[PDB]
Structure formats: C-alpha cells, structure tokens
Amino acid sequence: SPLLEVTDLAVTFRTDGDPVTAVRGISYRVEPGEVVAMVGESGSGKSAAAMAVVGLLPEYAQVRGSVRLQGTELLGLADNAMSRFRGKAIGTVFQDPMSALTPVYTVGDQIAEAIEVHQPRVGKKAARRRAVELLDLVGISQPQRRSRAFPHELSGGERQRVVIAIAIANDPDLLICDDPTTALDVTVQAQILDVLKAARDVTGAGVLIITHDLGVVAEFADRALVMYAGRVVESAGVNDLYRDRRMPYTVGLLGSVPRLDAAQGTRLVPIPGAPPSLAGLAPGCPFAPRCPLVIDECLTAEPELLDVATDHRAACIRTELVTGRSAADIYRVKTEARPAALGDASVVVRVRHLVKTYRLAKGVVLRRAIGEVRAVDGISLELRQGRTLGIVGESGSGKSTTLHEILELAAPQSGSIEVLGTDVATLGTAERRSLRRDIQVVFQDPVASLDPRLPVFDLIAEPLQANGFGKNETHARVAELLDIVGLRHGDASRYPAEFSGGQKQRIGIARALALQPKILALDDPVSALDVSIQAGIINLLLDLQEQFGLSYLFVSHDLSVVKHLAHQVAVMLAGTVVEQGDSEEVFGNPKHEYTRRLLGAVPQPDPA
Amino acid sequence: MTRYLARRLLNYLVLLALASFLTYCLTSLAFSPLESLMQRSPRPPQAVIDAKAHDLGLDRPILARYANWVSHAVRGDFGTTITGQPVGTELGRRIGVSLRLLVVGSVFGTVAGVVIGAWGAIRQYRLSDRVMTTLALLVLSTPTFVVANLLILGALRVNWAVGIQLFDYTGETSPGVAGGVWDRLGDRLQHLILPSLTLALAAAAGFSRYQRNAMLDVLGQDFIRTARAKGLTRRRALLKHGLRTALIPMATLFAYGVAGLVTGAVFVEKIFGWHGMGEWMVRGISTQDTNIVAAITVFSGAVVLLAGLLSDVIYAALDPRVRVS
Amino acid sequence: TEFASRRTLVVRRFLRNRAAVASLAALLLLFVSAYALPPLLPYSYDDLDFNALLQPPGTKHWLGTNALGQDLLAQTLRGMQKSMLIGVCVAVISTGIAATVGAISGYFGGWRDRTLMWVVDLLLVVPSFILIAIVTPRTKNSANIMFLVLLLAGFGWMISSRMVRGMTMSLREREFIRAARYMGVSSRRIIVGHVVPNVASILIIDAALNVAAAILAETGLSFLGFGIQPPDVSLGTLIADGTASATAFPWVFLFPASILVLILVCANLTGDGLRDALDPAS
Amino acid sequence: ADRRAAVGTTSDINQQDPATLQDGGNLRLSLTDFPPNFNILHIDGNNAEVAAMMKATLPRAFIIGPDGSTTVDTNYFTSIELTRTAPQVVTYTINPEAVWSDGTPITWRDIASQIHAISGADKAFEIASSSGAERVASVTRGVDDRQAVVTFAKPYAEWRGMFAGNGMLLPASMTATPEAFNKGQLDGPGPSAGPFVVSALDRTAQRIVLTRNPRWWGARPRLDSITYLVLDDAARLPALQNNTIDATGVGTLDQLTIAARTKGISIRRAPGPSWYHFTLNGAPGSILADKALRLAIAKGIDRYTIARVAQYGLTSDPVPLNNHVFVAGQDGYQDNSGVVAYNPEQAKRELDALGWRRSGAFREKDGRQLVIRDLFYDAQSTRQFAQIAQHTLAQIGVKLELQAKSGSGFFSDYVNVGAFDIAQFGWVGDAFPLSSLTQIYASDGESNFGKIGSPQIDAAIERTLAELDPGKARALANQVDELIWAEGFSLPLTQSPGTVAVRSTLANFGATGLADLDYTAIGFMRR
Ligand SMILES: Nc1ncnc2c1ncn2[C@@H]1O[C@H](COP(=O)(O)OP(=O)(O)NP(=O)(O)O)[C@@H](O)[C@H]1O
Numbered sequence A: 001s002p003l004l005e006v007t008d009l010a011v012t013f014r015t016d017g018d019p020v021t022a023v024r025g026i027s028y029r030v031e032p033g034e035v036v037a038m039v040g041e042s043g044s045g046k047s048a049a050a051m052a053v054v055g056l057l058p059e060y061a062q063v064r065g066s067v068r069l070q071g072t073e074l075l076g077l078a079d080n081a082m083s084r085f086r087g088k089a090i091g092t093v094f095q096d097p098m099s100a101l102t103p104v105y106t107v108g109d110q111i112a113e114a115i116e117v118h119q120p121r122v123g124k125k126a127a128r129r130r131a132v133e134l135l136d137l138v139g140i141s142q143p144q145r146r147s148r149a150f151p152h153e154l155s156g157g158e159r160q161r162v163v164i165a166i167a168i169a170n171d172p173d174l175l176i177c178d179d180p181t182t183a184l185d186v187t188v189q190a191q192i193l194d195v196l197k198a199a200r201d202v203t204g205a206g207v208l209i210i211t212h213d214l215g216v217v218a219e220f221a222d223r224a225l226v227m228y229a230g231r232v233v234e235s236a237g238v239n240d241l242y243r244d245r246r247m248p249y250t251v252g253l254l255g256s257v258p259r260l261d262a263a264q265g266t267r268l269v270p271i272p273g274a275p276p277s278l279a280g281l282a283p284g285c286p287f288a289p290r291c292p293l294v295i296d297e298c299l300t301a302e303p304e305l306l307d308v309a310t311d312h313r314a315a316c317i318r319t320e321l322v323t324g325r326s327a328a329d330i331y332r333v334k335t336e337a338r339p340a341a342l343g344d345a346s347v348v349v350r351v352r353h354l355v356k357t358y359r360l361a362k363g364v365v366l367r368r369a370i371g372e373v374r375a376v377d378g379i380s381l382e383l384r385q386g387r388t389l390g391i392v393g394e395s396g397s398g399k400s401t402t403l404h405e406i407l408e409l410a411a412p413q414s415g416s417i418e419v420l421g422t423d424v425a426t427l428g429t430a431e432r433r434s435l436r437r438d439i440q441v442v443f444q445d446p447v448a449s450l451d452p453r454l455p456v457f458d459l460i461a462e463p464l465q466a467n468g469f470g471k472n473e474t475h476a477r478v479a480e481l482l483d484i485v486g487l488r489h490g491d492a493s494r495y496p497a498e499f500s501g502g503q504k505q506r507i508g509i510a511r512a513l514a515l516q517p518k519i520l521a522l523d524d525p526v527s528a529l530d531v532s533i534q535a536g537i538i539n540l541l542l543d544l545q546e547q548f549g550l551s552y553l554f555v556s557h558d559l560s561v562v563k564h565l566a567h568q569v570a571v572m573l574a575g576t577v578v579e580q581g582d583s584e585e586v587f588g589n590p591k592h593e594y595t596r597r598l599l600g601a602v603p604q605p606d607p608a
Numbered sequence B: 001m002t003r004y005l006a007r008r009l010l011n012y013l014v015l016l017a018l019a020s021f022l023t024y025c026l027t028s029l030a031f032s033p034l035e036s037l038m039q040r041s042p043r044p045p046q047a048v049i050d051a052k053a054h055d056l057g058l059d060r061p062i063l064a065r066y067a068n069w070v071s072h073a074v075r076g077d078f079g080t081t082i083t084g085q086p087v088g089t090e091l092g093r094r095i096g097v098s099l100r101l102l103v104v105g106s107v108f109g110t111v112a113g114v115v116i117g118a119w120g121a122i123r124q125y126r127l128s129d130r131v132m133t134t135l136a137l138l139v140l141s142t143p144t145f146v147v148a149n150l151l152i153l154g155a156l157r158v159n160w161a162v163g164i165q166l167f168d169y170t171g172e173t174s175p176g177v178a179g180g181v182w183d184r185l186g187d188r189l190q191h192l193i194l195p196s197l198t199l200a201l202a203a204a205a206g207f208s209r210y211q212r213n214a215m216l217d218v219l220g221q222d223f224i225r226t227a228r229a230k231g232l233t234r235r236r237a238l239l240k241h242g243l244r245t246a247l248i249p250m251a252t253l254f255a256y257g258v259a260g261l262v263t264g265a266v267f268v269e270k271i272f273g274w275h276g277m278g279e280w281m282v283r284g285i286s287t288q289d290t291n292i293v294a295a296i297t298v299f300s301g302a303v304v305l306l307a308g309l310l311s312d313v314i315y316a317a318l319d320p321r322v323r324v325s
Numbered sequence C: 001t002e003f004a005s006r007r008t009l010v011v012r013r014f015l016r017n018r019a020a021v022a023s024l025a026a027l028l029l030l031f032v033s034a035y036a037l038p039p040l041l042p043y044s045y046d047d048l049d050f051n052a053l054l055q056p057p058g059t060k061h062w063l064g065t066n067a068l069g070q071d072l073l074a075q076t077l078r079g080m081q082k083s084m085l086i087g088v089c090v091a092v093i094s095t096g097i098a099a100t101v102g103a104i105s106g107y108f109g110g111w112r113d114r115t116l117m118w119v120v121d122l123l124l125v126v127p128s129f130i131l132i133a134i135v136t137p138r139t140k141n142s143a144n145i146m147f148l149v150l151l152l153a154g155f156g157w158m159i160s161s162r163m164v165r166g167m168t169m170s171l172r173e174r175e176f177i178r179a180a181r182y183m184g185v186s187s188r189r190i191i192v193g194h195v196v197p198n199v200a201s202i203l204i205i206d207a208a209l210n211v212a213a214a215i216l217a218e219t220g221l222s223f224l225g226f227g228i229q230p231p232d233v234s235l236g237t238l239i240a241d242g243t244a245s246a247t248a249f250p251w252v253f254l255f256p257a258s259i260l261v262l263i264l265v266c267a268n269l270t271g272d273g274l275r276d277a278l279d280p281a282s
Numbered sequence D: 001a002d003r004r005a006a007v008g009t010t011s012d013i014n015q016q017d018p019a020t021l022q023d024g025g026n027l028r029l030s031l032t033d034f035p036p037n038f039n040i041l042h043i044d045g046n047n048a049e050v051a052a053m054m055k056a057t058l059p060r061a062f063i064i065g066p067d068g069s070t071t072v073d074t075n076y077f078t079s080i081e082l083t084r085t086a087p088q089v090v091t092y093t094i095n096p097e098a099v100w101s102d103g104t105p106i107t108w109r110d111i112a113s114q115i116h117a118i119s120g121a122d123k124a125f126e127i128a129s130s131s132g133a134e135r136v137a138s139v140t141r142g143v144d145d146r147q148a149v150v151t152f153a154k155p156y157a158e159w160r161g162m163f164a165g166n167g168m169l170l171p172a173s174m175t176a177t178p179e180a181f182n183k184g185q186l187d188g189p190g191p192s193a194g195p196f197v198v199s200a201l202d203r204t205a206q207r208i209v210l211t212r213n214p215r216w217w218g219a220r221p222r223l224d225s226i227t228y229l230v231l232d233d234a235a236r237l238p239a240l241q242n243n244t245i246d247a248t249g250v251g252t253l254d255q256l257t258i259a260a261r262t263k264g265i266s267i268r269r270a271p272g273p274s275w276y277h278f279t280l281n282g283a284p285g286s287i288l289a290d291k292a293l294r295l296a297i298a299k300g301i302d303r304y305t306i307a308r309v310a311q312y313g314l315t316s317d318p319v320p321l322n323n324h325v326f327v328a329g330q331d332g333y334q335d336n337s338g339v340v341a342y343n344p345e346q347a348k349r350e351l352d353a354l355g356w357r358r359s360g361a362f363r364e365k366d367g368r369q370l371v372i373r374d375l376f377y378d379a380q381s382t383r384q385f386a387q388i389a390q391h392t393l394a395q396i397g398v399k400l401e402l403q404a405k406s407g408s409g410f411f412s413d414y415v416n417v418g419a420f421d422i423a424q425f426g427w428v429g430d431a432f433p434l435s436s437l438t439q440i441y442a443s444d445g446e447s448n449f450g451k452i453g454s455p456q457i458d459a460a461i462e463r464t465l466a467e468l469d470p471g472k473a474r475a476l477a478n479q480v481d482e483l484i485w486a487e488g489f490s491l492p493l494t495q496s497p498g499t500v501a502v503r504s505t506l507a508n509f510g511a512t513g514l515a516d517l518d519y520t521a522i523g524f525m526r527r
C-alpha cells in the first residue's frame, strides 16, 4: 500500500461570487522512497490540493475525493485521529512563512512543543536539547542562542527554515513541502535540499514538494506532475518530462527556464497571456486561449490524460505534433542575442572604496553597547551606460546597503560616487532632484514599498504626477505601463492588499519604469514570480535595454538569471567584493574559493 | 518579572501624587464653599465668616493649604465637611461599599465580554455572532441610568411572577437578617445581583467589541494552522496560541474599562440607593465641599491605577517578550 | 485611460453599505427635523395645558402630555435640539484638539513626545466624568451652552490623541515614504499624499464615536442635576423626570429614552460603516 | 381618587379588635433622612417625622379624638382638672405607675423643668415653640410629688396642648440645663416612658429600630418591632411594591396608581391640619426685604392653577388654601386672600412703579437682576410647585432660581439660619390651631424664619389670646390672618388630602387625620 493514493480530489471555495473550483479532479500517488514534484504556474491550484490532503483548508471549502494515507481514508476523520496522523506521519512545510510562527513563543520552545506532542513522555529538557540540535541540522547560524529568539527578530529566510525544522521534528513518514526555497539563497537552499535528501534516504519518506524553480526538480525529484487550472496536465519521470516535453503547456514551461550556460542576451520563451479565472471556466481545453496549436476540436471538450509513451501521460489531443520540436518552434519565436553588449565608454556609476556602518542597538534604556555591523567595507563598482552589473552573494553580504548608498545621492562616510558623471558632493537636495528622474529603484520587498491605502493607478502614477508630467498623459502612460508587465485596467482600482505576492512585485517594476530612467537599481524583482512570468520580464528588460540603452544594477538570489542579463558580475562576500569580471571569466572560470562553491551549489537544469 | 514591575509602579506612584495635587487645585478654584453661608439674609457676622474660613484652611494660599491637607491626610484624618462632621469617620466604610460593587462588576464583565468576543470571532457570520453583535451594539448604545431603570421596572414583575423575592433593589442589605452567616450572606447575594448586572452588562458590551477584532486579527494570521499541523487539536491550538496572542491588546484597555465602570458606579449607586462613594461624590459636589471631593478623587484614581497595574502584571504573564527577558 | 480617482473610489464603497447609509440618513433627518418641526405642531414648547394633564397620545397632543401639562412632543424636540447640538460641537472641538496634540507629539518624537504623552497619561488617571462634574458648579446657571461645550471637549481628546500619535509615529518610519523621496516627491507633498490621507480618516471615524461619547456625558451630567437646568430641557432631564411614571403612564418615559437610544444606535452604526469604508479589508 | 381635602370627623385606620390580631411582626416604614437632633423641643429637632416616631416612646397628657375631642390619658395621668377660673390653676396628677426608661419616676419637677425650659425667659435654650409656657406664672408641687398645680398669669384658653397633640413630655434630666437641651441628644434619644423604645441607631445602614418597653405599664403592644429606614422620595413607592416597607404617604397621581394597581396594599384617606406654602424672607439683606416687592410678586403666582396641578386625581375639584390660621374644615375658616388675588398686569404696573423695568428677558434695577432663590426638598411632588411657580413668574420677568436640597439638614442648615429667598415646606398642626400665632406670626416668634412682622400683628395676636369665648376669639384670629395676608408674609398653597398607602393586612394604623394612634393596638392580620 502506498503513502498517498489520492483519487479524484476536487476542492471548491465558496466565496460571495460564484464558487471557484481550485481543483477539478486530480488523482495521483506517492511511494515510500520517491520524490514527486508538482510544478505549474500561479493560480494552478497546487497549494489548494496539498492543504486539502492534510485537511487544513478553511471551513468554507468543499472537498470531495478519495485520499487515503495508508488505506485510512483521511476525508471523513474528525480532528481527533486527524491530529494523530498530523505531525507524526505528515510534515507540512507551508509556502509563505512570514506569519507561520506564534509571536509569543521562543522558536526553540516551538520546535520542542512539536516534538513533545507525539512523544509525550520525553522531558522538557531532552525535548529542548533535541530542538536546539535540529536548529543546526537545518543550518541556522548559532543554534544555542538563536533557540532563545522570538519570531519577530528573524531574517525571513531563517523563519523560513524554522518551519522546516518543525515539519521534520518528529521524523514524518511523509513530509509535504510547498515552495520551501523562496526566501533562501543558493548555499542555504543547497544544504536544505541536502537535509531533505537525507530524510528521503535514511528514513525512506515520500516528499510531496511543490516548487517554483525547475532546477530543484531536475536534480531532486523522481517523478513530476504539471498542473494547469485544477487538473494534472502531464505526468512523467523527470528524465521524460525533460527532453520529452510532449505537450504545449509544458513545452512553454520548460522553454522559459534560465540556464547557467546561456550566452549574454538570449531570450527565453514565455507563454503569452494570463491563466483563467477558475470561476467561469468556459468549455474546452483550458489552454485554448493561449495555446499556439489550438484547433476547433480543442474546444469541444476538455481532453483527459491518455498514454503517449511508457509511464507518460498528457492531456492533449494533438500531442503528435510536439515530439522532437523545441519551444522556439512550437511558439514560433526566436531566442538569440542581437545586443550581446551595448558597446560604450560612458561611465554612469562609479563607486570608490565605499564604507558604511550602522551603530548597533540591542538594549533599551542603559545598554552597554558593544560592537557594530560593518555592512560595507571598501567596494568599488562601475557601469557603462548600456550594460548591467550583477551583484550576487549570500544573505548579509551588503548588496542592498550598497544599492541604497548610491540612491541617496549624498556624500558617503567614505568614498566617491559619480552618478551620471559628477561626484555627488556639489549637488544637495534641489540639485539632486533634477538627477532623480533618471535613476530609480525596484525595492526587494514589494509589500512594504507600496502604500497599502492607494489604488494601483495612484501607486504607479506617483513617479509621474510628482515629476514633469500632466494629466492626460498620466492616464495614458499608466495604461501601457500596466499592460507591459501584464496587469489590467481594472486592477488599477484594486488596492495592494488584494494582490498576490508575485502580482504586487510587478507593480513595483511598473512603477519604477514610469519615467523611463537611464539607470535602474533592481533588488531581486523576480524573487516571487513563477518561471513563465519571470521569463516575460527578463525578455522585457533585455530588449528595453536594447532599443533605449538602459543601465541596470541587478542583484538576485539566483545566478542563472544573472547570466541572462549581466555583462559584468561582482561576487561580493561579507561586505567586500571578492571578484569582478566579464561574467564569462566569472561564471565560466571561478578563481576564488567562494565563487567556485557559489557556482557549485547552483542546480543543474537537466537531469542526470 | 521583579524588575519590570518596579519601574512600572514607581511611576504609578508619581502619577497618583501629581493627580491628587492637580485635582486639589481644580476643586479649590471651582468650588465656593462659603457662598451658601455668606448669602444668608441676616448676613452672618465677620466672626463666623473668619471662623468657618479658618476651620477649612481657606485663609491660606492654595499651595500652603494643599501641603497642610496632605500633611495629615497621610496621618489618618481628612478634615471636616462643610458642616464640621469628620470625613474619615465615613470614608472607611464607604470605600468597602463601592469596592464590592466594582470588583464584582469588573470581574464578571471583563470575563463575559472576552468570552463572548472570542466566540463570536470564531463564528464570524453565523446566526450566533449576529445576535451577540447586535446585542452588544444596543447595550453599548444606551446610557447606564436607562439600563438601571429598565432593569428595576422589569425585574419587579419577575418577583411578582415567582413570589419568593428572588432579588430586590433597595439598599445593600435588609433588616432582620439575624440567622447564621449563611442567611446574612444569602441576603447580600440577593441584594447584589441587579446593580452588578447593570455594571457587568456595560463592561461586557464594551470589551467584546475589542475582543472580536483582536481574535479576528490572529485568525487572519496563519500560525494557528501551523500549530495544528504538528498534532495540536483545533481547540487546544486556539486556546494555547490564538487566544494567548489575542489577549495582548485587551490588557491595554482593561484600565480604561475600569475607569468607565467607576463612572457608571455613580449612577448605579444613586439609582439603587447604595451608600458608597458615588453617592458621596454627588453629595459633595452639590454642596460644594472640597474635602469630600478631594478624598473621593484620590480613591478613584487609585482604583484606576491599581487596575492598570494588574493589567500590566497579566500582560507580562501572557507575553514573555515584554519583560526584560 | 479611464482610470478612476481615489476620493471617488471610497465614497462608492461607503454607498454600498446600506446599514451605515441608512444610519447617516436617520441622523441627518433627526437633526434637521429638530429645527423644522416645532413651528408646525399645534402646541408650542414651554407652554402648559392645565386641563390636559397626563393625557395619552391622541388628537390634540399626539405624543401625550406630562405631569405638568406639557406636550411631550415639543418638549422632546427641544431636548433633542440641545442634546444633539452639544454632542456635535463637542465632537468637532475634541477631535481638533486630539489631532493638534497627537500630530505634534508623533512628529517631534524624542523627549518632546515622551513628555507630551506622559501628560496625557496623567490626565487619564482620574475618570473624566468626575473631573467634569467637579467644574459644573461654575457654568451651571449660565445661559449660553458655550462653557459646557468647552468643558466637555477639554476632557475628551486624550484617548484619541493616543492613537493619532501612535500611528503618526509608526507611519513616519516607513518604507513607501522613503521610496516617495527616491522618486522626487517634495517633503510637503509626501505629507499631503501619504500622511494626511491616513490621519484625516482615522479622525473622521473617531468623530463619529466622539458624538456618542459627548452625548452620553451630557445626558449623564444633566441627569444628576448638573449640566442643563430646569427652565430649559435636555434629553437627560426629560428621562430623569419621566423615570417616576413609566409604570403607570409609560408615554412620558418610553419616548425620550427611545429617541436617545435610537440616536446612539445610529451614531454607532455610522461609526462602524465609516470604519469599514475607509479601511475596507481592515 | 375622588374625595374632598377638608378636615373631617372620622379616621381610616382599619380598626380591628386588638386581641384578634397577631402577637408580633415588623413594622417597616420609611423616613426622610436620619434626624440630626432627637430633642423635639429644640429648634433643629422640631420636625414632623421625628416627633411622629417619638410619639410612641414619650408621655402625653391627652388623647385626641377623631373630631378634636380631649380625654385625659388615664395611662399616663389620672386627673387633670381646671380648678381656678380667673387665674387658671390646672392640676396635673401623675400616675404612680409611670417610670422612665432609666427607672427614675415621673413627678412634678419633670413638668416644672419643661415649662421653664420652653418658658422663653432664658435665651440659652434654642427652643422651637413657647406654647403657653410664657403665660404661666409658676409651677408649684401639688399635695404629692405626683401632683403639680400650674398657675396661669395671662389667660390661656388653649392649655390642653402643652403635653398633647404635637407636644409631649420629656424627662427633667434633658430639660434641666441648656447643655442637655441643646447638645444632649445629637446621637440618640434619652429616657422614654412609652410602650416602645429605640434600641438600634444603626447609622451605617441608615436604620432606626424600635422595640417594646420592658417596663411598659399599660396594655402590652401587639406589635414587637418598628424599624424606620431612611429613604429618599425617589425610591419609596418601589420599596412598597417590592415588600420592603409597609406604609407611606401618597403625594402625586403616580404614587396613587402604583399603590392600588398592586395587590396586598390598601389606600386609606383621612385629611388633617397640614399644608404646604411658600415662605418669604423679609429679613434685612433679602432682595425681598421690600414689602411692596413681596406684595407685587405675590400677585404674579397663580395659586389656583398650582393647586389644580398639584392635587390632580387626588381630590375632586382641587382648590387652594386661603387662610393661615385655619384650614378647610375647622370652624371659622374663610377666604382672606383678596389682597393678593392673581393679577399679573397689576404686578407689572406696580413693579414698574417700583423700579424694576423690563430690559431683556428679566427685569433689572440699578444693575442687579430680579432673581429669587427657591429652596425646597428634592422630591417628586415638591418640585412641581416650583416649576409651576417659576413658569408663571417668568410671565412678568421674574427669575426664580430653583435649589433642590437633600433631606439631611434641610431645616437646620438652610431654613432656621436664613439661607433662602423663598422656602418650600409644610406645617403640621393639631386640634389646637391658635398655638401657631406666637410661634410663627409674631415678630419675635421662634419659628418666624423670615423675620417678617409688625407691631400691629403682635397687638392683634395678644388681643386674640386674651379672649376666652371661642366665638370672638375665632373672629379675632381671622382679623389677624387678614393682617398677615396684607403683609407679604407667606402664601399657603394647598391643604393635605391625607391619603396614605398601607398594606391591607395591617390594622389599627392608617390615616388618622385629627386623631392619634393607639400604639398598644397596632397589630397584623391573623391569617
Ligand atoms: N482560501 C481561498 N479562498 C478562495 N479561493 C481560493 C482560496 N485558496 C485558493 N483559492 C483559489 O484557488 C485557485 C488556486 O489557488 P492556489 O492554490 O494558491 O494556486 P497555486 O497554483 O497553488 N499558487 P502558487 O503557489 O502561487 O503557484 C485560485 O483560483 C484561487 O483564487
């Protein structure tokens, strides 16, 4: 008997508007020693199908399927045996753990309550020792004194890891992960994947892991489930799904992944359009609006999963025209690099020996203050008017601090920055004001940088009302501005709080592109986008720089995107840049121990 | 914590000591105790004028007479009334009369309101939260004297229907309770219901509206789901995590709730004929007596400050990151 | 191209909440009627009918008469006039004081904020009703209600100034205002477009419960004999007079009390609706 | 509901045979406020609902019948005869079985000390009445200490009222010296010689408890206890509804509806010589020290309308009181109020030929506004008079400021001292109406709280008191009342309807009117 054997699951949320059918009849299974990946776009009903297996859906949702853990049907249980399966035979890593921890409990005494629910006679001392020794298996820096911290003083990629510790605390028979590597960087997520593989190997547990990255799947998972609009679109082994895409949606999903061996300005292949609403859901194949091979037969009924190979199923009728051909053929586009580099000598940003320090604060009233953080320690950057400079590191490096330093346009604690040519020491606020319409920034966290009580039209059109723009040309620009990134005219009347995380990241990008600057400082603007929306935005940035010659200060948590944008890369460690170069003699020949292992922890895009 | 509370009450003492001074100055500027004496038709002689101004300290500056007031208000005696009767002879026995009502009403109201608010938040739109919401609205939206009068004239008919004299509304006790301690306790229990109901209704109606929002906030955040995803049943998860987190905002409103209850106790005591502190406040303001009012505001401020201190104790108890540790 | 504004985006959301709209309409109708109706009624206020004593509702006195022969409709209209005008004026002035204290305290910060909030804490020690009742010995037998309005307003801003400053302080240390400076927005335009929309609507929803609090204070004062004096009427005085006859002739107590309760219910409903319209999803 | 508010000749007490009642029971009946002094002969202890409670405990010479008849109290005295004619020598012969609470008997010196205490020849005593003690030459011991002759200097025909009706006898230990008189009983009563005594002066719960006399000498009472609980007017009828008291008085229409609309409570009615009035302060320093101002403001108060509003539903065709000496029902009553007939136009005419002219909402002269302070008890019935009076006075531009005081030290703190411009209170008389003359309406009267008077009034009062034949004395008293009316002294508003609300199971105790209770007979229903 397997571990999951889900059969005909269907979820329906009852909102005020007509019911939204998140899941419409998926069915799969998981075995003891295997990993099954569930990939798809956003809105595809993947979390709704996991939070429904564990039974933690809201009370306004109607679930009707045949999920049975070990022959035990889990849908009719009564939260007395359900909360005896939960935790001990089911681990659940949630997707966004920014409020997933009780604020009034120490993290150690949470990872300990987890342990001492299902092992009642264990001791509050041994339980806490085991909690603190889980905190270092997860990889948190100083487990002994961070096991005494409350959730509000954690990075975000650390409270993203406390959840993993809680989930794996009781050695579950089947842990279930939902995008467990968003807030992490390359090395942290590498070692988290090592932890998951150890759990899968020494214990022998299945892992229902949901991912936004397709490089994790290619090197960790065993099978794969592609989900579009509440149905499992395709099912194949990773070796089959790769190099045998076999269906248009997965064709355009795998052709829009960034690779570390790509040339400078090769363009990915995004699927053009937006996913359906899951409320109306007109008849026919749900991909018919966006499918490049739609025929009048693809609208008579929804196709069902039939077998085209051995252990390989696709929900398509004309799947005999997909074999062999590539995404650039199926979607009829070109993936080349006409503007490999925008040859020019106009330095636009030049930093020299920048230093920045914050006066540390720990106490309240009469603190005996000791020490301080030296965020930056003497770096020196440089740009050329038509090219991108990629800055990569690990959490705490100081990239965001440096980005902000250049943006205050004021003289630093030590150094000499030369925005657009001039050292910023003759320009004060009013002189810097005229220079503030050709250097802008995309904030790292979309949530805080947007005023939560202005509609989208007011947010996007603040950089325009303030500057030299009138009214009839403000509504006009906001119009095309929010179609370029993908929003819609109606969303303008919507407030920021009613948008998904990736949907309100694109509002920040659109807002920072309003004035068409000459320099753009982007702080991981693709940190919460799926693999297809992100490819649309990479294509946007690459050609915007082509015709208009824009300059980017790009920083990101993954290095495959940097390879597609940057001409020069600046690997930066502990507040100092340890290697600058041509992005081909940095990503193609690392010559510092750090960058060597920073590239060795980047998942390969294809299975072995 | 034993250091979080030292600095917490060291400033409560300062607040009390300064509020007493400011209130004494206020009721010395706003009171004219010799007006009814001065305006007698056979205008009374200069002597009785001077003698009565001396017996009240009215021949002294404001500050040099507040000093003299506190100097032996700290020693036990609080001075005469306008007629010459002592204040301390009655203050000690009216403090208890008011304190019984205050403690009963506050303890019942703040518990019932919290329970009602949390329950109505966990049942957000069913036909059990709507009833309590539109009931708390129309209880909070009526003044306390109206509530007391309606309770009296409705609760008379209950006694008529049953006939055993379940509760009455005249005074605090009744004559002839000469049995054992159980008769004398049942008597006061019977007398204590209606005024305490009047105070508790307002307290609960006020508190439940805050508790509903506080509980909805933590029902929005998805840490209860994480708590029950590790093996905690959905009742234990709520109690141990969500309620513990949602009770934090209420400890900062308990003091204001107690102040409102103290304000309502004046009307309650006046309507039900309880010889306590609210009746003395009305009497001492009507007759324009500085000593009675000075003794009463100190007591009321002390009650409010003690409520604040208890709220701080509880707030530290259920929130471990507000103590220094 | 046809993007809607923001001020016209919040008013529409208020309009789609029929409970608050009805409550506001009821309040406005009551306030206008308290001045429009009296010169229509067959019997004026302040005049006594001595052969129509304690009459029930009917065809000369529609709402009945009183122990002293007064029409209980004209009396309650006059009492409503006074009791509502006092509440409106007190709410406006107290909201103004609360704004001008909390804003300065929260923007200055540092020790200025520390002392300005310690003074508010000090003013909160002794319950407000007894502090106001202490000063009613003066301004008790005056004609104009100006002194009573000022007295009620001077002791009603503390709690709301607490929150005004508590949110100004936390709003000025934000990230979207820093981004606004990064764009090129002036120091004043940042305030006008980010702070004023925030603390200009919290004040709006605060001065809907200020009205209820002021009315409660006024009727509580006039009920005990302070506040408003015998020759002229208020709602609290009418209820206090009518207590002693509700059982036998209920029209003399049920009517003014029901009017007061209706006004307070409408005020609370309006406050809730305005809070839900200016803070849509909390 | 529907009767006449006139003094009658019958009482409504629910008579039953004393033997056929219970032998116990608690008489719960309320009180205005806790008395400040327990000496009823003192100026501040002189009160209606103090003397009423003290009636049971203290001696009394005469039993007053339902129509004003007098019989010697054979239980306290044995023989009270008028021996000599021209100088009257009335001989009080005390019972040998009369003792005081302490055990000291009652005797001649007990009467001599009282007659000297209220004699008025020693100003150290702060007395409230000098009824006949200033017209007695001397008090001499009779043949026995029990006996005590009383020789009268000036002719006093109303000699039966010293120790009867309103006044009673007090021990010599409380009237011997001014210390015990004035400052003796501010915390509790002294010795007493009645069927009941007070045993619990509970001031924490505001309750006075009366229990039986162990030394009682007459027919022992059927009742066992009489507890008075002081209680404001606002909640006195609800106290009756919820069974906390037994008997009260009904003052307004509501008090009467919610006493017969309930069950177990019966309503008795027998009017007595009690009445309400406006008392005006003419003492120098009062805005009303002007006789013309008093007489011009008296014409601006509609007493007929005030009566009609005040007693509505209590009395058919309610009419006001128009006599200071007598009330409607007593012999020799007539309308002497023609000089003060309500005429607001004449009031304005001679108020602008006096000086206060109408400049604004109210008149003012030389800068001061025409404002008059009204002093009254904060009750449900008493404030109606004030509201009607102020409404009617506003029609001539006179401001009447209302000041509703509490029950504690209303008299001793505001009325006996002069702290009013107009006062609102009532008088309670007895079968002896000519005793009010010197007490109130004389210029130096001990109850002349407003200090209004004139030599002509004093001479007229002496002429009435110097006459023996009742027929001429009544006409002389009527003339004195005409003189009082044409002075601005006071304004009698209404008589008393005498309707009390008692529990239906309570006997020998109701509204008596002109008669007095037999406290050894009050009992309860034998179910
Ligand atoms: N609580 C909910 N109430 C209403 N609709 C919901 C709820 N949860 C999910 N949905 C709907 O379910 C559909 C899928 O949502 P979701 O499960 O978040 O998709 P997903 O593909 O897992 N998202 P992502 O992880 O970002 O790729 C959408 O139509 C949602 O609006």
Ligand SMILES: Nc1ncnc2c1ncn2[C@@H]1O[C@H](COP(=O)(O)OP(=O)(O)NP(=O)(O)O)[C@@H](O)[C@H]1O
Residues within 6 Å of the ligand: A358, A360, A373, A374, A375, A393, A394, A395, A396, A397, A398, A399, A400, A401, A402
């Ligand atoms: N306000 C602050 N107070 C104290 N230290 C700070 C503050 N802001 C930043 N730092 C320190 O500055 C250093 C670098 O921070 P930051 O620039 O956010 O790093 P980063 O590596 O660029 N972040 P990220 O892009 O998310 O990976 C760390 O040591 C921080 O703790």
Ligand code: SF4
Residues within 6 Å of the ligand: A248, A249, A285, A286, A287, A288, A291, A292, A293, A294, A295, A298, A303, A315, A316, A317, A318
């Ligand atoms: S079934 Fe038709 S519309 Fe759907 S993916 Fe296949 S070809 Fe496209």
Ligand SMILES: [Mg+2]
Residues within 6 Å of the ligand: A046, A047, A048, A095
């Ligand atoms: Mg999801």
Ligand SMILES: [Mg+2]
Residues within 6 Å of the ligand: A399, A400, A401, A444
């Ligand atoms: Mg950063």
